[model samples]
Target chain A: PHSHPALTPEQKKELSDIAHRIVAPGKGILAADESTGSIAKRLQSIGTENTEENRRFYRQLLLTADDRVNPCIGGVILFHETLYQKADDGRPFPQVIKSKGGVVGIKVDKGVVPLAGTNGETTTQGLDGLSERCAQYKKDGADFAMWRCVLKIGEHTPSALAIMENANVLARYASICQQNGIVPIVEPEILPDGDHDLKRCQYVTEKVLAAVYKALSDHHIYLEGTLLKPNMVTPGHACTQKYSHEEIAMATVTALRRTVPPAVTGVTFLSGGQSEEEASINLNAINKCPLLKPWALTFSYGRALQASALKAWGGKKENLKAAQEEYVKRALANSLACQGKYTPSGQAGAAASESLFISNHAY
Target chain B: PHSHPALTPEQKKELSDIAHRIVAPGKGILAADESTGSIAKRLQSIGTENTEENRRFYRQLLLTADDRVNPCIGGVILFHETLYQKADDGRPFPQVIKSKGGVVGIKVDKGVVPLAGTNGETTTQGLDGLSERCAQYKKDGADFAMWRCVLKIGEHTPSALAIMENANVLARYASICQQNGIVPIVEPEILPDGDHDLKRCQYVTEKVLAAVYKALSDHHIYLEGTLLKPNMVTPGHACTQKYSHEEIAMATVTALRRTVPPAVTGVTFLSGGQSEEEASINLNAINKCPLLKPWALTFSYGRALQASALKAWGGKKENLKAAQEEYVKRALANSLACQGKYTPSGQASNHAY
Candidate 1:
């Protein structure tokens, strides 16, 4: 008696097409959508002032990489400020991304809000006027949008309230985005902050993703119109037990297979602070793992994509060529990793293999 | 790696024993735990002043019923006020209930709170000081507790958020109750307020219960220490689709079997706005559905058990005998109905049948 169609077939086809293109073979996302506060931290680490001009110059180096990155980077997600900023050659960043054959995306969520009655857990904000924002972003040359909701594992953390609340908010965000003709990438990132083992992370990931998909179904969201940006299942930062890349890949893929629907377009994984080389290798193993992943498995990384490049630039305009080369190298490595063709190159530059992990990372 | 045992084996056994006893054969709960606000409506319908004396008088009529009810009723759930009230003979209500071979249950939840960003949905809010309250209630002679979380079936309602929030709260409540040596009746009632068919209610009930049990497991609440207080799967109040009691029974039992683990002690059906006779007959049909019910299936009625009696009282002290008679008759009828042995007596009056 309470029947409502989820989406028109035409709308489904449009969203599905955009999502597939973003995670097309040998392609993945370049997550350059760091908020001002997050980018300030990145700049601070490199001993640079967090000024708009310097930020623009750094972002331009990555966006204007060699033509070799054209096939590797299929989508570029920009923060609101970056989306409006122009490149050094006077092209808007969105235009520069589009000119390189990549779909432009915008991060739409405001940030996280603390959940009451929990021990330091939160759900995402920014749904207050998300529908209008998605519509305007779609009109402004954006084909997809991303909203990140964070979860944590701790003693009595990731409580039931946090999981359900975040999942429902993500679903509501996705529904609104689709109604506005923009593909929504649903990101429910479980933080790897505890001393828990791989099995613990796997269990939490399975429960969290199951709740996410069920919420999507209840909200009448079209699965074909959505992409999942989940953290790859792994042991916590303090976990002492060692695991192989194959073990992590098996855990990650098994969790997705159990919870993610076959109709979903793709799963673009967050590196969750893994080093550039480590992220590529784990993803390579994930793609190589003998499992039937119904959706495209690829990368949606920020630090993993830009860590080496940031060190190369070193806040100097003269190092622009060196930074662009670093960006292109990591992009090429990930491109091959996504297709499981990557070899151990030992080619990472200074500070590239350093642990980029920040406890409870905000970007 | 992050294991924290929610209950000790001894605590688990105590709760399991109490839950099983409360739903023993041909036995169920007498839900007299209506809040003062809810009881005001009941008293208003009968043109009585909403006074403490009047409320106690009415409750007395049910609690002091003849020995026939002693065998019929397995548990007696009392509101916070009623739990401490004295019977005319100077005995607390809990003592009076315990003397009748029934477990005393206290309604522990404060009430429901509005969930933002949902379609007028809510989650129960009583956990602020629930652990302490449960401990005191256990010391006050309460062996079990009831915390109700309401859900409604509608277009785009009982949303995923609503289901998950309510279920998690219920589990938290259960976990607290078990730690304090009290069995918990996990009531997630899906309201019958739409024109939806029975199938829709069944589907929603299945999903809601599935989430509930999963949360219970996640919170480490022992299933054996809990009882499910679920709404019977039925067509909505305004549904035009006709169905037999057998069909309703089939749907209700099927939903439970699919979602509720067998470790649960029993299921005490909530008689949500059902007529007196309809409640008894449907429960009878449930018992006779030719299915393997590993747990007790019986009634935990608020209105269905007290409707006819409340009307018979008519706020007249002189009608006490007549009201007591009405209450005992229904109790006796339900007692037989729970065992699938009742014949329609045609004794219900004032639309009770």
Candidate 2:
């Protein structure tokens, strides 16, 4: 079929350039883009008061990391509040991340709204005036954006309507983002909330990704200008059976191979509430898996990247240095893991083995 | 496969009841719902003035028919402006049709707009504030609504994008209409505008209808509260191949059984520019075809029902009586056609928007 080509070679080149820079070799994303409400849970866990001043201090600690993590963080996604918040020297947060050689991305969706017809399934909103929002964010020093749509695993949970409706909205948002020079990180997350098997998760993942990419194609999106933020295929949290890292990687990549086209620039796996060490080890195995992987496989972790650091800070000024050191350590581990070079040492931080999951309102 | 259960059993019953009343035996929809621009061209063709009074008179001619067509005219779908217009005796058009034992319906879609990434395809609009509009239309005596989405058949035309996008839009409209207690007539018409064979049209028709029903199911539409206003599966206009009405009927019913669920209240076919005599014969053959038909199969024609009357009227005072008679003849003929009882004249051929 002939294309209704709207983007010129230059517009497309800009998108691909932004996408490629975010998933560069030995690199991954630092998803510091948690909503204020999402960040509150992490704060409450550390006995810290959730306030803008505290949020600023906590985020400043991560972005102001030294050159040791310069190559580890390929991209940094920020909340709208964090994007406008500045560092101690009054340099904007984007400048702080740019100085550290990381591309800046914004979270564009308002939040998930319930789809009326499905069994508690929700589609992402914020599309009412997304084009204007994307244009302004692009001018505000953001080069990429991410919107997440969640699906659940059940006998009839992720109904056909939820899959297509979420996919359609994702495509519409992606199209608008690209029109304004922003690379879109397309995320279709299947929650690991059921007592389902690995095969079931793999099946649901295949169906969801197939619907997603088909939607992108239908909207005539330039795939090379986009990145995928997907959950690694794993058994549900309450599933009786167990699988090793090798089995999970095989299932994840195979499902992706069957559905995701090669032109998409990268696959940035969301941690999806996994513990820090487990997330890094699984990502390492995914990269080490023996498959002809076509796109960059990397991490775009939020909780797994910062859980230990939050516990170390303890809401005390005396422990800010301790928190920043803990943050850099995990960042280096993921950097190596993304390159298939991480060695899982049994000895780890206090929060390394602690599960980071919350509830549906968790995201 | 537990349903989400937003619609109560009673809510569903009202929709099904409204749909059944529109397509009762020997009864079909009378589509008098043409856009202003669409009617302007028709008025221009007949050299009649395109004014409010003239439109009111033309529509009054059809709705004010004698009791002879009381049973034949099952429904009358009106354009929004016409619904507010009254007859010479000052009776509103909806009340006029209701008095004649016909269900009153309204057209809800604004119009078709181009799908950006396709080759001359479109999805229908007018969903922006549709719920409020439906609520108002319901209070205004409309019990059913129609929204038409257009598709074209070509080598790569009606691409997967066009099919799903149009189907999804129709589902959204259907869901909203049902919530406001209006029975929705979901029309996804594949225009007979190509040289493709009867087989190609049948294949495309199956694909399009399959997508339509899936979208409706996904959106939690109550199928029993819905009517399908589909283009009768037929060969393209430019194609030279010939087939008997029986063959066309087989292709048509086969596509319907393959995609449309029996829970749907009825199937009301659009004329798609077919001549009055030809449409009636084809419908008759469709009803006569050998398949375990579970839904009402009938006509919801616009031009085919009024073409003869428009000609007979000739925009003159003395021709009014002749116009009413011409309209009733087609109505009576289609009534028999819906029951597989019409006889057709050999010489005929004609067209609508």
Candidate 3:
């Protein structure tokens, strides 16, 4: 294909405008759906049944979380299987989300493939034929795409090959999605899988993100029309020391502001498996941090937003409404935190979040 | 696993030595066998039959082309299908080339895959499980690997994406092959495919060769153990003008001397559809071009060395001896040209010699 010429002034304006809108005050994403493996793990933790019936019920409840949830959840990302699944009345979940005015996004990555000689790290695959898939998803009501490429911290963490390969693949995926009219959620998540200090995570995070953005520019991907789904700069799960929410917030926002272009649409953080309250508090802190953030700081959480909701449901039909309400409250809390308007006095929101559980770290 | 740190000085010395040896004096490559498709095209051009038996007999004639041809031929690259095929009396071609003291090489690429959304452009695609394949080829008596990635000039040509992607792939392929004891011939050829001038071709050649070598460094491939098979820098095919051998030589040598690493073993220029005589003359001039060439300048050609040989074969058994003579003459000429030792009208050895 011919090379893309330098962006015209008007094209640049369009890109910048799209970026600013997503980060607008009080607006953030609602990550109501989870992949089967992820939801199974969450279910396994709470002594609840992990079955198709229960998963459908769990996500259906989260997606239908009351009207109060709508004002905050600007977008709702659905797993492919969940995107077509229905609510109790037999309405498709996407219909429910769209009727409620939430933009629907689909996660398009096929999961990670092992990098041959790294420290057991991997790069995400599924780009083999991503363009055709994105077009179909767009036709099926997907307005954006999400792909998570995981990186980690260690003595030999984030090899240049890993960083460069992942960045290029992400750009290739994002560029193809944009050509077919899908706003891509460009996520190169640095997994919190070590005993390292928060500062070390921040250093690696900054370098990786910088490399990612440079690759996107080289590939001529319109960064303004894209969203960044990144891990919040936080200490590794096994670290003995705890950092203040403000400190984590300052680190996260400052790293992004330095590396991310003002042209990017928004920065919706992965929970990095943080608690519900911690997720909201961090989002609020990110917005409240005394630094200039060019993009919106908000939450695009899966477990943090649904752990309580799932527990409330307990796979019981009688608990659907309250369970749904619990989901909405958390969503509302995150929505407020995204606006930098959330208060710490309430237990009804993402304020109930924390990083209680851990995994063997995956993409 | 963490990276094994960069190559040590000792390793670099060993690699450079291997590279310098293959392209040494009075030695150029002999591309004795062609694939069915390539040979078919050549046969079609001359309106001759292209049967398998004819192809085998024709190659056999070239292989046994006497001691005179051996001096000039350093290595012989064979088509995978022909590597095991023998002379009429049944002798492996690899054995034949080896008996004459020549290195045996194999073309490892599985052809090209179209780079989506380009002007009919492509990247070489044999990378899927190439390391294992390289090991197998090494065990089967191959000392080197050859992969050719082609680029052509056009409007908005040689996209940085194409160049970078191809270079990185070549480097990745080269490093993998090297780890298993196979030298790689990194050929990223920009064909004489546009209405471009000689200067434009040289400029693109410089940029492309520079990128390939840089990628080789990045991947930490042993450059000294690698060779470059590049196209001769020349004007576009349709450019209504022809230049003397000196002009072509000046451009070709200047491009390599400026961009190719001095550490590389040697350079084997592709004929890129040039006739046999032109190909030899061009190499001859490239060596005498007054530029200081660090690596050995030689020929690694197919059609340019075999067009006349195929014509003489004409799918006829009776003409096999004549075809053999044609092969030996061309090989002898290329060998002399490679060493910068070809005096005008140097060797008079023919079929009757």
As for DockQ, the candidate ahead, 2 or 3, is: 2
Q: CAPRI verdict on model 2?
A: incorrect
How is the predicted docking of candidate 1 categorized under the CAPRI scheme?
incorrect
Q: How much is A58 displaced in model 3, in angstroms?
A: 8.4
lDDT of 2 by residue, B51-73 (tens): 98889899999999889888998
Q: Worst lDDT window (10 residues) for model 1 chain A?
A: A113-122
Q: Order of all candidates by DockQ, from best down to worst?
A: 2, 3, 1
Full ranking by TM-score: 3, 2, 1
TM-score of chain B of 3: 0.91
How does the DockQ of candidate 3 come out?
0.11
Which regions of candidate 1 fall more than 4 Å away from where they truly are?
A: B1-353
Provide the lDDT at A257 for model 3.
83
State each model's CA lDDT, in order: 0.86, 0.89, 0.78
What's the residue-level lDDT of A75 in candidate 1? 97
Q: Write one digit per residue (lDDT tens) for candidate 1, span B1-353.
A: 34546666787788888998998887878999998899999899989999999999899888988787898889999998888888899988889899999999999887875554456776666664566788899999899999999998877888876887788778767877887898999999999999999889999999999999988876667888889999999999999989899888888888887888899989988889999989999988888777677888888888989898999998998989889888877777777777777678553311111
Clashing pairs in 1: none
Best prediction by TM-score: 3
